[PDB]
Amino acid sequence: PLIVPYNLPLPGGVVPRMLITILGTVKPNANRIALDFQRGNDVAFHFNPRFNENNRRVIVCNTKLDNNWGREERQSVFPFESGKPFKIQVLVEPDHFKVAVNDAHLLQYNHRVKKLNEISKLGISGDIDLTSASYTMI
Ligand SMILES: OC[C@H]1O[C@@H](S[C@@H]2O[C@H](CO)[C@@H](O)[C@H](O)[C@H]2O)[C@H](O)[C@@H](n2cc([S@+](O)c3ccccc3)nn2)[C@H]1O
Ligand SMILES: [Mg+2]
Ligand SMILES: [Mg+2]
Numbered sequence: 001p002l003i004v005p006y007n008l009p010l011p012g013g014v015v016p017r018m019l020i021t022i023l024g025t026v027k028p029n030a031n032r033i034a035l036d037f038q039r040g041n042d043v044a045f046h047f048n049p050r051f052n053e054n055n056r057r058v059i060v061c062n063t064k065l066d067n068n069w070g071r072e073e074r075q076s077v078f079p080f081e082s083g084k085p086f087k088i089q090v091l092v093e094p095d096h097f098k099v100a101v102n103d104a105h106l107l108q109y110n111h112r113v114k115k116l117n118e119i120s121k122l123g124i125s126g127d128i129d130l131t132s133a134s135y136t137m138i
Contacts, residue, residue, distance in 0.1 A: 005125040013117035030127035044113035
C-alpha cells in the first residue's frame with residue numbers, strides 16, 4: 001500500500017497504446033477521488049469521481065490551463081462503491097483517453113492538451129487506500 005497523494009512519474013509522457021492501471025480500495029465514507037494527468041502545472045486530464053454532489057454521485061472531467069478550469073464533461077455512470085476494491089485503466093488513444101473501471105468501459109475524454117509526450121506526471125489523490133499504480137504497453 002502506498003500513501004496518498006501519490007505521484008506516478010510518466011517519463012516521456014503518454015503515447016497511444018499506453019495502458020495506465022490504478023489499483024486501490026475506496027474508503028468507507030469517501031467523498032472524492034482524483035486522477036490528474038499533468039503537463040507542468042497544467043492538468044491535461046482531471047478525472048474526478050464525486051460521491052456526494054447534491055446527494056448525487058457523478059464523475060467530473062476537465063482540463064486546467066494557466067490555472068483556469070475549462071468546460072466540464074460529466075458522467076453519471078458511477079462504478080465506484082465505498083469500501084470496495086477498484087481498478088481504473090486509462091488507455092491512451094490518438095484522439096482521446098479511454099477509461100474503464102473494473103474491466104467495463106466508462107468514458108472517453110478528447111485530448112485538449114496535445115503534447116502527450118510532455119504529460120509527465122500522474123497525481124492520484126482522495127479518499128482511497130492506494131495499492132499500486134503502474135503502466136505498460138499493450
Ligand atoms: O471543473 C473541474 C473542477 O471543478 C471544481 S468545482 C466547479 O466549480 C465551478 C465554479 O468555478 C462550478 O461552476 C462547477 O459546477 C464546479 O464543478 C473543483 O474545485 C476542481 N477540483 C477538485 C479537486 S479534488 O476534488 C480536491 C483536491 C484537494 C482537496 C479536496 C478536493 N481539485 N480541484 C475541479 O474538479
Ligand atoms: Mg475519435
Ligand atoms: Mg471521437
